[PDB]
Amino acid sequence: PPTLWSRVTKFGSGWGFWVSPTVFITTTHVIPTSAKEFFGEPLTSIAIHRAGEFTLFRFSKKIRPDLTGMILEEGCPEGTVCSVLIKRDSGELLPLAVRMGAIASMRIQGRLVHGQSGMLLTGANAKGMDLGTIPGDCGAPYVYKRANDWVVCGVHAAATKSGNTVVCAVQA
Amino acid sequence: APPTLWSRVTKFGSGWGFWVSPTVFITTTHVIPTSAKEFFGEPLTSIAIHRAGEFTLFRFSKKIRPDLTGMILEEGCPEGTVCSVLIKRDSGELLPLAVRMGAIASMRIQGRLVHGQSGMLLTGANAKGMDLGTIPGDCGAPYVYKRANDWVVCGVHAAATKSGNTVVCAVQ
Numbered sequence: 001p002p003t004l005w006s007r008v009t010k011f012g013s014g015w016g017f018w019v020s021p022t023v024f025i026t027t028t029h030v031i032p033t034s035a036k037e038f039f040g041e042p043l044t045s046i047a048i049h050r051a052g053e054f055t056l057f058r059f060s061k062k063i064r065p066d067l068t069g070m071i072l073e074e075g076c077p078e079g080t081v082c083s084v085l086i087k088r089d090s091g092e093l094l095p096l097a098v099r100m101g102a103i104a105s106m107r108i109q110g111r112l113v114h115g116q117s118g119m120l121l122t123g124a125n126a127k128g129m130d131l132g133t134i135p136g137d138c139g140a141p142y143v144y145k146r147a148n149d150w151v152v153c154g155v156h157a158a159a160t161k162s163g164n165t166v167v168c169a170v171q172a
Numbered sequence: 173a174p175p176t177l178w179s180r181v182t183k184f185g186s187g188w189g190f191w192v193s194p195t196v197f198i199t200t201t202h203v204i205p206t207s208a209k210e211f212f213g214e215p216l217t218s219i220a221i222h223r224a225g226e227f228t229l230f231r232f233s234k235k236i237r238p239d240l241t242g243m244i245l246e247e248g249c250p251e252g253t254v255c256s257v258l259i260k261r262d263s264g265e266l267l268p269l270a271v272r273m274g275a276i277a278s279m280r281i282q283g284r285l286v287h288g289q290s291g292m293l294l295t296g297a298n299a300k301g302m303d304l305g306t307i308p309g310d311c312g313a314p315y316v317y318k319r320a321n322d323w324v325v326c327g328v329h330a331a332a333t334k335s336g337n338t339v340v341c342a343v344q
């Protein structure tokens with residue numbers, strides 16, 4: 001049985017997530033701007049749907065036939081605790097709990113980012129402990145368990161260097 | 173978590189243990205093979221075993237791990253401390269699970285009576301199972317945290333509840 005973690009894939013300047021054998025999601029700003037193929041498939045044959053910082057790829061053949069299709073939703077109810085599935089180039093896996101809030105345009109460092117706001121639940125500092133996000137983590141998925149079903153509801157877009165606030169980019 | 177801490181995490185019996193120094197190895201009592209008379213090629217004869225419930229410390233009369241520096245072992249940590257549990261999973265994947273620590277507790281978990289420092293996972297809200305939580309093969313994994321300039325070890329993994337949200341650290 002393939003774990004959720006096998007779906008998290010290094011991509012461009014960050015990461016993305018296999019929803020099904022043909023559907024891959026990522027953060028718009030990590031996608032290469034010079035490319036003729038992705039994952040060995042010509043761009044000719046890839047449908048790209050971009051909505052702000054959320055991008056969905058639909059391939060015309062099965063790239064990951066080992067996977068079953070997962071539920072993808074447009075964000076989650078306010079107050080849902082998601083996990084952000086962060087992979088690091090050390091080989092570390094860092095699932096971090098995030099309390100999700102409203103859809104909003106928020107001021108994060110310099111910039112306006114639109115998506116579902118969240119607050120990390122790992123406490124005061126990261127302190128140099130594995131407890132917060134870094135810039136290279138963009139495109140990591142937000143997931144939660146609902147009855148028996150895993151749900152993916154967006155991708156990591158931005159975070160304040162001051163610890164607390166993250167933005168999850170969502171579909172549509 | 174730093175490479176030197178992962179280097180100390182050792183496959184042992186039905187779980188793990190942890191090298192505090194070149195001569196001192198800690199583990200959870202229930203993962204030790206019951207018939208074993210030799211450890212790291214040394215007879216029992218040559219080892220000082222200190223057992224307190226589900227905490228076991230092995231002190232060797234020679235240096236088994238001379239590559240290592242001795243580090244600090246404490247008797248649990250203050251309430252509110254966020255620790256990492258250093259868990260190794262199928263394929264050089266490294267899972268430093270975030271846990272908020274609480275009080276010393278006595279519990280009944282699936283007809284075992286367990287005594288140690290309780291904690292709650294900070295990985296997600298319904299953490300049951302291998303992607304966001306602990307599995308029985310994780311017993312003996314160390315609980316560590318960073319204090320100013322230093323890292324500390326403060327116990328080893330002993331148990332988790334049926335729900336997976338509560339864990340117990342065995343302490344010296």
Ligand SMILES: CNCc1cccc(Cl)c1
Nearest residue numbers: 079080081098099121297
């Ligand atoms: C059920 N939601 C989790 C949570 C996290 C942090 C604070 C509160 Cl009020 C609730």
